[PDB]
Ligand binder design. Structure first.
Ligand SMILES: [Mg+2]
Ligand SMILES: [Mg+2]
Ligand SMILES: [Mg+2]
Ligand SMILES: [Mg+2]
Ligand SMILES: [Mg+2]
Ligand SMILES: [Mg+2]
Ligand SMILES: [Mg+2]
Ligand SMILES: [Mg+2]
Ligand SMILES: [Mg+2]
Ligand SMILES: [Mg+2]
Ligand SMILES: [Mg+2]
Ligand SMILES: [Mg+2]
Ligand SMILES: [Mg+2]
Ligand SMILES: [Mg+2]
Ligand SMILES: [Mg+2]
Ligand SMILES: [Mg+2]
Ligand SMILES: [Mg+2]
Ligand SMILES: [Mg+2]
Ligand SMILES: [Mg+2]
Ligand SMILES: [Mg+2]
Ligand SMILES: [Mg+2]
Ligand SMILES: [Mg+2]
Ligand SMILES: [Mg+2]
Lengths: 55, 271, 117, 88, 100, 51
RNA sequence: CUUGAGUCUCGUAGAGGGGGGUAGAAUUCCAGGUGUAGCGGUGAAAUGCGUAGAGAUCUGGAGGAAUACCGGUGGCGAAGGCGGCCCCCUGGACGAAGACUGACGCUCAGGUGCGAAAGCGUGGGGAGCAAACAGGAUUAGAUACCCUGGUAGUCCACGCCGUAAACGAUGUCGACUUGGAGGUUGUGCCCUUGAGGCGUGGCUUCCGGAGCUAACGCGUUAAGUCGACCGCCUGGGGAGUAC
RNA sequence: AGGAGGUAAAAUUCU
RNA sequence: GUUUAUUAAAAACACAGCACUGUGCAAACACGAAAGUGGACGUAUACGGUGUGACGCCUGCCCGGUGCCGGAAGGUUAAUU
């Protein structure tokens, strides 16, 4: 959001297979649903949270 | 730089030069060169052992350092020079003790670049270590086959070996001949790719280009009579023969490697 | 053989003929038996039933080396997906864990054009 | 579009005071100033077609309003191009 | 002078090259009068997934103000150091000082 | 995907079996190319999925 | 003269364009470990792959191309068209206050430039896919549709080419006429008094009045009402052909 | 009660 | 450009360019019973061999035969025992 290191949260926006969550389910604001992706996806790049869930 | 030159005259028309604008214009460094007389491709016996060879320009030997044995001591690239004796270009270097040498110039360097050699001696283009001290994957040229025996592998213009394993006391390496081949790993090697890789973009363009390069007309085996070559005679443009060297052996396909003493060093051979 | 008792079953349901093998935990391997040259061959493979029986002939030769359990990761779409495990837990191996391993790209390579039956 | 600071300089001498930001003298000056620096951007890159499209607007507009004054207050132009650079 | 957020990470068996870095970066950004407004360091940390087949690796952070430079010749100092394993330099968005 | 579920029974479990992926994203990524007809899939899967 | 128009100011969102960087999943291949007679493929087959050991599985290593989820009658661009992440360069649009300018405009034959894919040149690159080509089927035939392969090419660089159902088949600008659901991005005011209360901008999707229409349909983003200027049509063919 | 995935193969002609 | 010195100067040979193929260096290859030597004080952007013959548009089908490059299961086989 205002932060991506918020790995604290986020985890309430990504499934038990490691998938980002549709904005129709999570029901989040649009302008800020993007701000989530460019920040969850930011954070999976430096392995604080995974892409997959099998390795 | 490659140039196409205009059709001022045929056999200029197809020409294509390689023009290197920071190759030192003028006379090479005297004390590092010695005479070098041509052969015609004729051996001590007097016979033509290799043919197509002879005639074409005079050519003084530059003594390049293929060993790079003087470790420590920085050396500075004073200038880049043309070399007749090979496609590659050389670099007159000045070791900080006053000694001077020639080295196969790699893709990188220019005037003023520092270089050196030794069991540490940095790790940039122009620097020489034992391969027991170069990262795997590292790109290298002027490779040694037996340590202390100077560089033999990948010396031609724009040429290179990449090291590609370590396997213990040898060090498997692949030569863009396509062949991977273990080698004793105390064997040295210089960082970088070599020489103006632009070399192969030349076109020559006329016959005389080749003549003054040393090389000499090649005459077909069917242009001849059957006493001259096994591609026989004719009676008007004829063949019907399994292609062959003048001495009888098949050309095309006929593998002719024999050396089992080294077959223990080849691991995957070119294709 | 040497008897572990703790192993795993790798199952590949390609569709067209559907296959299953078994290995040890770090993933060595010891037994195919598979729907193809084994109870027909042709459209009467690639059937769920054939996966059942494909699991059985596996079972009936994947014993020894202990095994009395197994992790069971599974590769495929279509028939034989479940019906193997359905017969595996019936032959009496304690179904420890199951897993997806069907390869999903992040769209990576072109797939093959033009096919209307 | 250059720096928010920049252009601060160029409104003087061209303009009668700061925040006199609308005399045809300044925009022209603002344009040229960008264009000139901005020709560097198209040295490198150069296959950046789209960015160029914006450029020519600057050039079109510049020229369009450099022609406007030619009709009003003669030699209010011949006191600025040489003051700047361009009449090719 | 615009702000950047930096967050590199270097492999386990050379964590303790820690401060050896930071200082020269301060010499590199004090030498370009740009106050960093919050530093952090948090070594031992496990990974979402292995890398080069290795779990765990040392981390850091920043939010430095600096010239649109140094990051030129710094973002490239992560282009030697076979030592360091990953990086990221971020946008800006005003200053930074709390989260963690 | 990776499933463990606790304790006593045998049922392969999960009315959430078609969890996130398999059956579906494998059809798509498998069949073949597209480019023009995911645009037709678009103005149909939500030209109809209006009301 | 300031209201059309532009300039300055602080910001906004954006897959706008160009450069360099890096991640992650899969396909293919290289080397091994275990492992044994089948794999693959179809409507059914067979070609092909496998007893030097395939397919399955594990570990390791190459290399190329594309960015799952976000993703959506979502945004962005003049159009073509643009989707992982990261910094550098840069374009445009929009909002708000006020400041300057003072008609600086609109349109545009000529002219200039941009312009999907395939295609061309020089080289480099090549994992997948796949014109051509080959083999397996299919069939009366099968130069096809289906299957095993497969080169150009698809990728990069630099220079060509300049066409698409390049379409909304709807030229650009401005002004004027009931409405309903939204989507999305700003911003002014009022107990943060909510994820607000009350407004006001730009874009945008569906429905629909009047009116228009040959009808289909269009319907404030017009095909309604007007005006400026440009391009174009005058029966089917011949022909977007010949010179 | 939503989504998902799989269900028709080839087969010409009529002053 | 070269060539039948002394009846043939040509459309013949050479040519730059193209391709096939062999060569990891004690290279292939050649001259040498050998030693040694050329190749080369070069190192696959190299060197040898064969065919083609600037350039432009291009270079189709055929591996049964003869060659050459791979093979192993066997069948057949040398000296030898
Ligand atoms: Mg030749
Ligand atoms: Mg020849
Ligand atoms: Mg003759
Ligand atoms: Mg003879
Ligand atoms: Mg004849
Ligand atoms: Mg692997
Ligand atoms: Mg890779
Ligand atoms: Mg901008
Ligand atoms: Mg263009
Ligand atoms: Mg193209
Ligand atoms: Mg091309
Ligand atoms: Mg047209
Ligand atoms: Mg279109
Ligand atoms: Mg409507
Ligand atoms: Mg309305
Ligand atoms: Mg209208
Ligand atoms: Mg025409
Ligand atoms: Mg019919
Ligand atoms: Mg008939
Ligand atoms: Mg002549
Ligand atoms: Mg004569
Ligand atoms: Mg040759
Ligand atoms: Mg000829």
């Amino acid at each position: 959001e205002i932060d991506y290191k918020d790995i604290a949260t986020l985890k309430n926006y990504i499934t038990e297979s490691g998938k980002i969550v549709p904005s129709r389910i999570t029901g989040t604001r649009a302008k800020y649903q993007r701000q989530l992706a460019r920040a969850i996806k930011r954070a999976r790049y430096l392995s604080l949270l995974p892409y997959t869930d099998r390795h | 730089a490659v140039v196409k030159c205009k059709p001022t005259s045929p056999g200029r028309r197809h020409v294509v030069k390689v023009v290197n604008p920071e190759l030192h214009k003028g006379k090479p460094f005297a004390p590092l060169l010695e005479k070098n007389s041509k052969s015609g491709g004729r051996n001590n016996n007097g016979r033509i052992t290799t043919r197509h060879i002879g005639g074409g320009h005079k050519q003084a030997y530059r003594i390049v350092d293929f060993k790079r044995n003087k470790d420590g001591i920085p050396a500075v690239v004073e200038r880049l020079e043309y070399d007749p004796n090979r496609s590659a270009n050389i670099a007159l270097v000045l070791y900080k003790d006053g000694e001077r040498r020639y080295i196969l110039a790699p893709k990188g360097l220019k005037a003023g670049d520092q270089i050196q050699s030794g069991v540490d001696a940095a790790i940039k283009p122009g620097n020489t270590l034992p391969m027991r001290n170069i990262p795997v994957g590292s790109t290298v040229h002027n490779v040694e086959m037996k340590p202390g025996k100077g560089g033999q592998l990948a010396r031609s213009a724009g040429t290179y070996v990449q090291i590609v394993a370590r396997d213990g006391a040898y060090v498997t390496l692949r030569l863009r001949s396509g062949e991977m081949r273990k080698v004793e790993a105390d064997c040295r090697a210089t960082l970088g790719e070599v020489g103006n890789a632009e070399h192969m973009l030349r076109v020559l363009g006329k016959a005389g280009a080749a003549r003054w390069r040393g090389v000499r007309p090649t005459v077909r085996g069917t242009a001849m009579n059957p006493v001259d070559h096994p591609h026989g005679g004719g009676e008007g443009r004829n063949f019907g023969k399994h292609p062959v060297t003048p001495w009888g052996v098949q050309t095309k396909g006929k593998k002719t490697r024999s050396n089992k003493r080294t077959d223990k060093f080849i691991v995957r051979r070119r294709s | 053989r040497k008897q572990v008792s703790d192993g795993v079953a790798h199952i590949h349901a390609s569709f067209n003929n559907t296959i299953v093998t078994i290995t040890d935990r770090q993933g060595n391997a010891l037994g195919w038996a598979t729907a193809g040259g084994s109870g027909f061959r042709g459209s009467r493979k690639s059937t769920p039933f054939a996966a059942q029986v494909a699991a059985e002939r596996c079972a009936d030769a994947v014993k020894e080396y202990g095994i009395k359990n197994l992790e069971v990761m599974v590769k495929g779409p279509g028939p034989g997906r479940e019906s193997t495990i359905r017969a595996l837990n019936a032959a009496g191996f304690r179904i420890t864990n199951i897993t997806d391993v069907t390869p999903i790209p992040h769209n990576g390579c072109r797939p093959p054009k033009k096919r209307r039956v | 579009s250059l720096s928010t600071e920049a252009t601060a300089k160029i409104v003087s001498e061209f303009g009668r005071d700061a925040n006199d930001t609308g005399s045809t003298e300044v925009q022209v000056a603002l344009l040229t100033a960008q264009i000139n620096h901005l020709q560097g951007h198209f040295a490198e890159h150069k296959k950046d077609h789209h960015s160029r499209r914006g450029l020519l607007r600057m050039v079109s507009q510049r020229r369009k309003l450099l022609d406007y004054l030619k009709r009003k207050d003669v030699a209010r132009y011949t006191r600025l191009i040489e003051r700047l650079g361009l009449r090719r | 002078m615009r702000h950047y957020e930096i967050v590199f990470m270097v492999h386990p068996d050379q964590s303790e090259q820690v401060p050896g870095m930071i200082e020269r970066y301060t010499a590199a950004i004090t030498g370009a009068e740009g106050k960093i407004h919050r530093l952090e360091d948090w070594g031992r940390r496990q990974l979402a997934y292995p890398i080069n087949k290795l779990h765990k690796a040392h981390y850091v952070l920043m939010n430095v103000e600096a010239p649109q430079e140094v990051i030129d010749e710094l973002e490239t100092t992560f282009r030697f150091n076979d030592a360091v394993i990953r990086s990221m330099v971020m946008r800006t968005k005003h200053a930074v000082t709390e989260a963690s | 995907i990776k499933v463990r579920e606790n304790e006593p029974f045998d049922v392969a479990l999960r009315r959430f079996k078609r969890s996130c992926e398999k059956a579906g994203v494998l059809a798509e990524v498998r069949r073949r190319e597209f480019y023009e007809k995911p645009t037709t899939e678009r103005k149909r899967a939500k030209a109809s999925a209006v009301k």
